[PDB]
Amino acid sequence: ASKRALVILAKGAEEMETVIPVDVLRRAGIKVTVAGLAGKDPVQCSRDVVICPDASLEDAKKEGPYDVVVLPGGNLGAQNLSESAAVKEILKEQENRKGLIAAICAGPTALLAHEIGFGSKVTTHPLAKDKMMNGGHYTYSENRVEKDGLILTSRGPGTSFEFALAIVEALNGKEVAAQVKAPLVLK
Amino acid sequence: ASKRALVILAKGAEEMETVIPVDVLRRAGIKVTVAGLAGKDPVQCSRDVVICPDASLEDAKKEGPYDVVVLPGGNLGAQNLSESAAVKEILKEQENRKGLIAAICAGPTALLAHEIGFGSKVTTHPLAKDKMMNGGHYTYSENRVEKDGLILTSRGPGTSFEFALAIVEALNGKEVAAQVKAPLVLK
Ligand SMILES: [Cl-]
Ligand SMILES: [Cl-]
């Protein structure tokens, strides 16, 4: 069967970090559900792009499991993900069932909030390092994309393509990732 | 006053090529209006991301003039832009008043449809070259971003950041563009 991805979309999410992975994952033939943290209604992103989710997280979470759970960044978006008991449950289940978790920019700080993947190497946006590293529960990396087993992290809007292609490679392999990459006109 | 950008959003637009420029332009303090070609309703993009426009094009076009008119790509999106009499009028007015026009991927083929900027150097997505070059009305470039006076073009999802930063540089200068670029974590 086709792989499935859950992208959790909260108010204040970085819209580039949401749309690039959704689009690239769909190019890879992955079934992506854009799930609204707050419910079914349109979501106002950090730079005021308004995105209509495919489903509420409440509904989407009952349609698991997913091959990857994707956490976009955006400072406020990531704070909303960090405060969510529903997100906690989803991430813990994903970690338990040995499933990929991918987070970008401020997104990885939600892993800290929910105590996910301690002892991994991770990266974040430079400005999110101190939050992520509070307590020394991870080892910090400056790689544009970092992958330590099932914890896949990345740095910012400008690393979103690399982040998304790394998810494609992890799920569908290097050849599919290369095939999806070529038409994008990446440098 | 702050500069103003009109981003014309049609069904089948490439969502990455829409969101990256909207977001980057807003980071540059440019007032961006995401205007729906079809009206006020949400727009289903090429990879099924659904974006709610700020206004209909019908309404937004009466609130001109704009310092830049931005045409995203996506094969079907660009075909819709190419067929639109409203887009024709907006582009002709912009060209007449000596205003910047920026188009990416398949987007530049709408310039051909509406007879805009003939005799310029332009680039497009590699797969859109033949359509753009029908009749030899432009000179083709393989640069990731091409700018020939007031016609600014670019190639694909993977050149969207460069495209958007080039628009910022054209409107607000090199220093602002550099300032906006740094936090993005571009390579
Ligand atoms: Cl942010
Ligand atoms: Cl397309």
Short mmCIF file of C-alpha atoms and ligand atoms in Angstrom, two decimals:
data_model
loop_
_atom_site.label_atom_id
_atom_site.label_comp_id
_atom_site.label_asym_id
_atom_site.label_seq_id
_atom_site.Cartn_x
_atom_site.Cartn_y
_atom_site.Cartn_z
CA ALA A 1 0.00 0.00 0.00
CA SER A 2 0.95 3.66 -0.38
CA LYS A 3 2.68 5.22 2.61
CA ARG A 4 0.72 7.74 4.71
CA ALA A 5 1.85 11.02 6.29
CA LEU A 6 0.17 13.12 8.97
CA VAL A 7 1.09 16.81 8.84
CA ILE A 8 -0.14 18.62 11.94
CA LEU A 9 -1.14 22.19 11.20
CA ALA A 10 -1.46 24.70 14.05
CA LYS A 11 -2.16 28.44 14.09
CA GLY A 12 1.11 30.32 13.53
CA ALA A 13 2.76 27.47 11.63
CA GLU A 14 5.35 28.52 9.08
CA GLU A 15 3.38 28.12 5.85
CA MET A 16 6.45 27.40 3.70
CA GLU A 17 7.46 24.62 6.09
CA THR A 18 3.94 23.22 5.84
CA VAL A 19 3.32 23.47 2.09
CA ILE A 20 6.75 22.34 0.85
CA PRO A 21 6.61 18.99 2.70
CA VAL A 22 2.92 18.42 1.85
CA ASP A 23 3.55 19.09 -1.84
CA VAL A 24 6.83 17.12 -2.09
CA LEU A 25 5.36 14.14 -0.19
CA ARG A 26 2.36 14.10 -2.57
CA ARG A 27 4.79 14.22 -5.53
CA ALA A 28 6.30 11.06 -4.03
CA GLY A 29 2.87 9.34 -4.12
CA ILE A 30 2.53 9.49 -0.32
CA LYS A 31 -1.02 9.96 1.00
CA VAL A 32 -0.80 13.15 3.07
CA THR A 33 -3.41 14.30 5.57
CA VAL A 34 -3.11 17.96 6.55
CA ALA A 35 -4.73 17.85 9.98
CA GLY A 36 -5.85 20.99 11.77
CA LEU A 37 -4.80 21.06 15.41
CA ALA A 38 -7.74 23.28 16.42
CA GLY A 39 -10.38 21.53 14.32
CA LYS A 40 -11.68 21.53 10.75
CA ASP A 41 -11.49 25.28 10.12
CA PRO A 42 -8.95 27.21 8.02
CA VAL A 43 -5.62 27.91 9.74
CA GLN A 44 -3.93 31.31 9.83
CA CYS A 45 -0.21 30.68 9.36
CA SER A 46 2.70 32.82 10.59
CA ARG A 47 2.80 35.08 7.49
CA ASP A 48 -1.00 35.11 7.17
CA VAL A 49 -1.38 32.51 4.44
CA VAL A 50 -4.65 30.75 5.27
CA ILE A 51 -4.70 27.00 4.63
CA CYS A 52 -7.78 24.75 4.77
CA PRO A 53 -6.88 21.46 6.44
CA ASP A 54 -8.04 18.13 4.99
CA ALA A 55 -9.40 17.10 8.38
CA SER A 56 -9.35 17.99 12.05
CA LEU A 57 -6.57 16.36 14.06
CA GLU A 58 -9.38 14.94 16.23
CA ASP A 59 -10.68 12.99 13.23
CA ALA A 60 -7.33 12.29 11.55
CA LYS A 61 -5.81 10.80 14.73
CA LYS A 62 -8.44 8.03 14.64
CA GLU A 63 -7.36 7.10 11.09
CA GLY A 64 -3.82 6.06 12.04
CA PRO A 65 -1.30 4.71 12.08
CA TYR A 66 0.84 6.86 9.80
CA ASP A 67 4.25 6.10 8.31
CA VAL A 68 5.43 9.57 9.26
CA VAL A 69 4.20 12.34 11.54
CA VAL A 70 5.40 15.73 10.34
CA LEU A 71 5.72 18.81 12.56
CA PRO A 72 6.18 22.12 10.71
CA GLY A 73 7.92 24.99 12.46
CA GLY A 74 7.01 28.60 13.02
CA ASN A 75 7.61 29.79 16.56
CA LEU A 76 3.92 30.10 17.52
CA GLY A 77 2.90 26.97 15.59
CA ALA A 78 5.50 24.94 17.45
CA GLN A 79 4.35 26.40 20.78
CA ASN A 80 0.80 25.26 19.95
CA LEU A 81 2.05 21.77 19.06
CA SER A 82 4.04 21.68 22.31
CA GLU A 83 0.98 22.51 24.43
CA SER A 84 -1.26 19.88 22.84
CA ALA A 85 -2.18 16.69 24.69
CA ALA A 86 -3.40 15.22 21.39
CA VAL A 87 0.00 15.81 19.80
CA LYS A 88 1.66 14.23 22.85
CA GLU A 89 -0.44 11.07 22.40
CA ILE A 90 0.19 10.85 18.65
CA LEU A 91 3.94 11.30 19.01
CA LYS A 92 4.19 8.78 21.85
CA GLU A 93 2.23 6.24 19.83
CA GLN A 94 4.42 6.86 16.79
CA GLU A 95 7.59 6.47 18.86
CA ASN A 96 6.24 3.27 20.44
CA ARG A 97 5.30 1.64 17.12
CA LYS A 98 8.76 2.52 15.75
CA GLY A 99 7.51 5.06 13.20
CA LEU A 100 9.26 8.04 11.65
CA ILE A 101 8.85 11.48 13.23
CA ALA A 102 9.98 14.53 11.23
CA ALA A 103 10.16 18.11 12.56
CA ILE A 104 11.60 21.35 11.12
CA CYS A 105 12.72 24.77 12.39
CA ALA A 106 11.00 25.35 15.78
CA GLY A 107 9.05 22.11 15.22
CA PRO A 108 11.58 19.91 17.05
CA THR A 109 10.92 21.80 20.30
CA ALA A 110 7.57 19.96 20.42
CA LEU A 111 9.62 16.73 20.68
CA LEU A 112 11.19 18.19 23.82
CA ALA A 113 7.80 19.24 25.24
CA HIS A 114 6.45 15.71 24.78
CA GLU A 115 9.68 13.93 25.83
CA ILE A 116 10.17 12.27 22.43
CA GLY A 117 13.43 10.77 21.17
CA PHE A 118 15.74 11.84 24.00
CA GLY A 119 19.38 10.99 23.35
CA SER A 120 19.12 11.68 19.61
CA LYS A 121 21.15 14.05 17.48
CA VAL A 122 18.84 16.84 16.32
CA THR A 123 18.95 20.15 14.52
CA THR A 124 16.60 23.15 14.70
CA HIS A 125 16.49 26.70 13.50
CA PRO A 126 19.53 28.47 15.01
CA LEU A 127 17.14 30.65 17.08
CA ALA A 128 15.39 27.55 18.49
CA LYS A 129 18.59 25.84 19.71
CA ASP A 130 18.47 27.09 23.30
CA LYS A 131 14.84 26.01 23.75
CA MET A 132 15.55 22.57 22.25
CA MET A 133 18.69 22.07 24.32
CA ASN A 134 17.17 23.01 27.70
CA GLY A 135 18.19 20.12 29.96
CA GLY A 136 20.66 18.59 27.51
CA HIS A 137 18.25 15.85 26.39
CA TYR A 138 19.50 15.89 22.79
CA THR A 139 22.83 16.44 21.08
CA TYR A 140 22.85 19.42 18.76
CA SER A 141 23.73 19.25 15.07
CA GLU A 142 24.27 22.04 12.53
CA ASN A 143 23.53 19.76 9.57
CA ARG A 144 20.81 21.15 7.30
CA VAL A 145 18.94 17.87 7.74
CA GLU A 146 19.71 15.52 10.64
CA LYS A 147 18.48 11.96 10.90
CA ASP A 148 19.15 9.81 13.93
CA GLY A 149 17.18 6.64 13.43
CA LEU A 150 13.50 7.56 13.46
CA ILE A 151 13.98 11.21 14.48
CA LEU A 152 14.45 13.38 11.40
CA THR A 153 14.97 17.12 11.93
CA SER A 154 15.81 20.20 9.87
CA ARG A 155 16.55 23.90 10.24
CA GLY A 156 14.36 26.41 8.42
CA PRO A 157 12.27 27.49 5.44
CA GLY A 158 15.39 27.24 3.27
CA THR A 159 16.00 23.61 4.27
CA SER A 160 12.38 22.55 3.65
CA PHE A 161 13.06 20.89 0.29
CA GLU A 162 15.98 18.90 1.72
CA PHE A 163 13.82 17.98 4.74
CA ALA A 164 10.93 16.80 2.57
CA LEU A 165 13.19 14.83 0.22
CA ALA A 166 14.85 13.20 3.22
CA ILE A 167 11.41 12.01 4.37
CA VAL A 168 10.71 10.66 0.87
CA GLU A 169 14.06 8.84 0.91
CA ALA A 170 13.38 7.37 4.37
CA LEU A 171 9.95 6.04 3.32
CA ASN A 172 10.21 5.25 -0.40
CA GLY A 173 13.98 5.07 -1.02
CA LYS A 174 16.76 7.05 -2.68
CA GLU A 175 15.63 6.45 -6.27
CA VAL A 176 12.10 7.81 -5.71
CA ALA A 177 13.61 10.80 -3.87
CA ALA A 178 15.93 11.47 -6.82
CA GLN A 179 13.01 11.14 -9.28
CA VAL A 180 10.89 13.61 -7.30
CA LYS A 181 13.83 16.01 -6.90
CA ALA A 182 14.71 16.46 -10.57
CA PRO A 183 11.65 18.41 -11.79
CA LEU A 184 11.89 20.79 -8.82
CA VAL A 185 14.91 22.66 -10.27
CA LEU A 186 16.84 22.62 -6.99
CA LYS A 187 20.43 23.93 -6.95
CA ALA B 1 4.63 54.12 1.83
CA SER B 2 5.10 50.35 1.93
CA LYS B 3 5.31 48.63 -1.45
CA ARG B 4 2.34 46.50 -2.57
CA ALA B 5 2.27 43.13 -4.36
CA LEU B 6 -0.59 41.40 -6.14
CA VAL B 7 -0.26 37.61 -6.26
CA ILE B 8 -2.83 36.10 -8.61
CA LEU B 9 -4.01 32.69 -7.43
CA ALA B 10 -5.75 30.35 -9.88
CA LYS B 11 -6.97 26.77 -9.53
CA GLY B 12 -4.06 24.39 -10.20
CA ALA B 13 -1.40 26.90 -9.15
CA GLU B 14 1.77 25.40 -7.75
CA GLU B 15 1.26 26.00 -4.02
CA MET B 16 4.98 26.18 -3.22
CA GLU B 17 5.42 28.85 -5.90
CA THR B 18 2.51 30.76 -4.37
CA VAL B 19 3.33 30.49 -0.67
CA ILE B 20 7.10 31.04 -0.85
CA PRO B 21 6.78 34.43 -2.61
CA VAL B 22 3.82 35.53 -0.44
CA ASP B 23 5.69 34.66 2.75
CA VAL B 24 9.07 36.11 1.68
CA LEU B 25 7.46 39.33 0.39
CA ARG B 26 5.64 39.75 3.73
CA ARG B 27 8.95 39.17 5.55
CA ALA B 28 10.24 42.12 3.50
CA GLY B 29 7.40 44.33 4.83
CA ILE B 30 5.64 44.34 1.45
CA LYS B 31 1.82 44.46 1.58
CA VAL B 32 0.76 41.33 -0.31
CA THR B 33 -2.75 40.67 -1.61
CA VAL B 34 -3.40 37.03 -2.51
CA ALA B 35 -6.16 37.49 -5.08
CA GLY B 36 -8.34 34.61 -6.22
CA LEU B 37 -8.77 34.49 -9.98
CA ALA B 38 -12.17 32.78 -9.73
CA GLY B 39 -13.52 34.83 -6.84
CA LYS B 40 -13.35 34.92 -3.05
CA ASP B 41 -13.51 31.17 -2.42
CA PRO B 42 -10.68 28.82 -1.39
CA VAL B 43 -8.40 27.67 -4.22
CA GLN B 44 -7.40 24.07 -4.84
CA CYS B 45 -3.74 24.11 -5.84
CA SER B 46 -1.87 21.60 -8.01
CA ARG B 47 -0.95 19.26 -5.11
CA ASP B 48 -4.29 19.79 -3.37
CA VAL B 49 -3.22 22.33 -0.79
CA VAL B 50 -6.25 24.59 -0.36
CA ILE B 51 -5.49 28.28 0.13
CA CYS B 52 -8.01 30.97 1.11
CA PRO B 53 -7.33 34.15 -0.88
CA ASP B 54 -7.33 37.56 0.80
CA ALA B 55 -9.71 38.89 -1.85
CA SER B 56 -11.18 38.11 -5.24
CA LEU B 57 -9.17 39.36 -8.20
CA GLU B 58 -12.34 41.25 -9.18
CA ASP B 59 -12.09 43.29 -5.97
CA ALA B 60 -8.29 43.42 -5.71
CA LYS B 61 -7.89 44.76 -9.27
CA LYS B 62 -9.84 47.89 -8.28
CA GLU B 63 -7.36 48.55 -5.43
CA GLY B 64 -4.33 49.06 -7.68
CA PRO B 65 -1.84 50.02 -8.71
CA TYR B 66 0.65 47.50 -7.35
CA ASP B 67 4.44 47.70 -7.29
CA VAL B 68 4.64 44.11 -8.51
CA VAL B 69 2.23 41.64 -10.07
CA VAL B 70 3.27 38.07 -9.31
CA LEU B 71 2.25 35.04 -11.40
CA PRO B 72 2.88 31.65 -9.76
CA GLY B 73 3.37 28.60 -11.96
CA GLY B 74 1.78 25.19 -12.02
CA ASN B 75 0.81 24.02 -15.48
CA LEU B 76 -2.97 24.31 -14.96
CA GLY B 77 -2.70 27.49 -12.88
CA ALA B 78 -0.72 29.17 -15.65
CA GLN B 79 -3.25 28.00 -18.25
CA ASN B 80 -6.01 29.63 -16.18
CA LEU B 81 -4.01 32.87 -15.93
CA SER B 82 -3.41 32.75 -19.69
CA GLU B 83 -7.13 32.46 -20.46
CA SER B 84 -8.18 35.34 -18.22
CA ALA B 85 -9.23 38.69 -19.69
CA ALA B 86 -8.88 40.23 -16.21
CA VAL B 87 -5.26 39.08 -16.02
CA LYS B 88 -4.66 40.49 -19.51
CA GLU B 89 -5.93 43.92 -18.39
CA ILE B 90 -3.90 43.93 -15.17
CA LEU B 91 -0.68 42.93 -16.92
CA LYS B 92 -1.15 45.46 -19.71
CA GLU B 93 -1.79 48.21 -17.17
CA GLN B 94 1.27 47.18 -15.17
CA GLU B 95 3.44 47.14 -18.30
CA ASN B 96 2.09 50.56 -19.35
CA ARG B 97 2.73 52.20 -15.97
CA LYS B 98 6.28 50.77 -15.99
CA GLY B 99 5.72 48.38 -13.08
CA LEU B 100 7.46 45.12 -12.21
CA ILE B 101 5.96 41.83 -13.42
CA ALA B 102 7.29 38.59 -11.91
CA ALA B 103 6.42 35.07 -13.10
CA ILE B 104 7.78 31.61 -12.22
CA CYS B 105 7.82 28.10 -13.71
CA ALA B 106 4.87 27.88 -16.18
CA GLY B 107 3.79 31.36 -15.02
CA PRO B 108 5.74 33.21 -17.74
CA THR B 109 3.62 31.53 -20.43
CA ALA B 110 0.79 33.87 -19.34
CA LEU B 111 3.05 36.75 -20.44
CA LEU B 112 3.08 35.16 -23.91
CA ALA B 113 -0.71 34.69 -23.90
CA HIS B 114 -1.24 38.36 -23.07
CA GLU B 115 1.58 39.66 -25.32
CA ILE B 116 3.56 41.13 -22.41
CA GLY B 117 7.24 42.08 -22.52
CA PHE B 118 8.12 40.76 -25.98
CA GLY B 119 11.82 41.03 -26.79
CA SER B 120 12.89 40.28 -23.21
CA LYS B 121 15.20 37.56 -21.93
CA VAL B 122 13.10 35.12 -19.90
CA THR B 123 13.39 31.78 -18.19
CA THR B 124 10.72 29.18 -17.37
CA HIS B 125 10.54 25.65 -16.11
CA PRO B 126 12.47 23.48 -18.61
CA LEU B 127 9.19 21.76 -19.55
CA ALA B 128 7.52 25.12 -20.29
CA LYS B 129 10.24 26.36 -22.68
CA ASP B 130 8.58 25.26 -25.91
CA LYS B 131 5.26 26.89 -24.99
CA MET B 132 6.99 30.13 -23.97
CA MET B 133 9.15 30.22 -27.10
CA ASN B 134 6.34 29.62 -29.61
CA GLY B 135 6.84 32.39 -32.18
CA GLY B 136 10.26 33.46 -30.89
CA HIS B 137 8.91 36.49 -29.02
CA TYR B 138 11.40 36.16 -26.16
CA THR B 139 15.00 35.06 -25.83
CA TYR B 140 15.45 32.04 -23.60
CA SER B 141 17.68 31.96 -20.53
CA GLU B 142 18.72 29.05 -18.30
CA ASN B 143 19.50 31.33 -15.35
CA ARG B 144 17.67 30.30 -12.18
CA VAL B 145 16.29 33.83 -11.98
CA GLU B 146 16.25 36.12 -15.02
CA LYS B 147 15.57 39.84 -14.90
CA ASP B 148 15.36 41.95 -18.03
CA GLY B 149 14.22 45.37 -16.91
CA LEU B 150 10.72 45.01 -15.52
CA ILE B 151 10.22 41.36 -16.53
CA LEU B 152 11.48 39.05 -13.80
CA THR B 153 11.19 35.29 -14.37
CA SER B 154 12.28 32.07 -12.69
CA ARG B 155 12.26 28.30 -13.20
CA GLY B 156 10.57 26.10 -10.62
CA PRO B 157 9.62 25.27 -7.03
CA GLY B 158 13.34 24.98 -6.22
CA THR B 159 14.05 28.50 -7.48
CA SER B 160 11.15 30.08 -5.57
CA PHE B 161 13.29 31.52 -2.76
CA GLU B 162 15.72 33.08 -5.25
CA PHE B 163 12.74 34.41 -7.26
CA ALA B 164 11.10 35.94 -4.19
CA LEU B 165 14.36 37.48 -2.93
CA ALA B 166 14.98 38.93 -6.39
CA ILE B 167 11.58 40.66 -6.18
CA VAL B 168 12.47 41.99 -2.72
CA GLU B 169 15.79 43.29 -4.08
CA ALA B 170 14.08 44.94 -7.07
CA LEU B 171 11.55 46.74 -4.83
CA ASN B 172 13.32 47.38 -1.52
CA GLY B 173 17.02 46.97 -2.38
CA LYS B 174 19.89 44.54 -1.84
CA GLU B 175 20.30 45.20 1.89
CA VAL B 176 16.67 44.40 2.75
CA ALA B 177 16.90 41.28 0.57
CA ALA B 178 20.03 40.17 2.44
CA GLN B 179 18.35 40.86 5.81
CA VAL B 180 15.28 38.81 4.85
CA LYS B 181 17.46 36.00 3.45
CA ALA B 182 19.59 35.32 6.52
CA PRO B 183 16.96 33.82 8.86
CA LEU B 184 15.70 31.51 6.10
CA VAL B 185 18.71 29.17 6.35
CA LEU B 186 19.24 29.01 2.59
CA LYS B 187 22.30 27.18 1.23
CL CL C 1 8.46 31.89 12.82
CL CL C 2 2.68 21.71 -12.28
#
